[PDB]
């Protein structure tokens, strides 16, 4: 059997980011169980822990290894050099090697839809945003969310609190409570766990799930969620290893390609659901790209001209906010 390994930055118990990775591992086992065997390690920190943990999985005989967090980028590039018969698949990074692929999702496409919904739902026009770490993926998401909201309410605001890691349920909960205490009427996040959405549900504040459909933790208050569909990708790459056709590739895919999808649209009026559907549909067809001008930056300078679509290279290094965001970027 092909031994396939997984490194997670959190626990499957997060019921968000790591959980979606592990549910996709389970999809792999269900589709190719007779020919594949999976192993994982969880709560693996960036840096030395990641290097040792990736090396250990390779030394145990795993011939395809998925490193499922951005901070594993450099550790995966380093370790891959020492294991030429192993194939490595790094999540959300932009670095590849002869035996290392990079798989990224346009999560910001889902953020745009959520922003549209948020601007229709929030009576105050204010959302609480729980940031993880200020890497370009997160800045993209904040910016896209705001642009979506601003296509309904030009005056929409977000209040951002940084947790400073991907998974930290204590700080995620604290951030949600602080944002709700400060008067926001929508909660959203780029951290990994269900901590904030349960706080929001406990306070009757409507929210978006992250990575996974988190409806079970907020049945009457989740509006939708940006859902990461890793399973078909994991199956395809395992098949490619099994049949000997696996080759290094760098990909960045979104709704059109099926890597990102919205959860069902719940707890909102029918016209808001119709508009969410229409928005997702326009992104999925290629008609709507959230980062299409006119768009100005936080400091007032123009970014994109009327009708001008962003280059992906700009997004991948994104380190500025669009006009309307109040946060100072770390
Ligand atoms: N949303 C996320 N959670 C954890 N690790 C990540 N790496 C990239 N995006 C991530
Ligand atoms: Mg497009």
From Swiss-Prot:
The lineage of its organism: Bacteria, Pseudomonadati, Pseudomonadota, Alphaproteobacteria, Hyphomicrobiales. It comes from Brucella abortus (strain 2308). Keywords: Signal. This is Purine-binding protein BAB2_0673. GO terms for cellular component: plasma membrane. It comes from the Bacteria. Binds adenine and probably also other purines, such as guanine. May play a role in adenine and guanine uptake. May be part of an ABC-type uptake system for adenine and similar ligands. Adenine binds at residues 17, 166, 192. Belongs to the BMP lipoprotein family. Pfam families: Bmp.
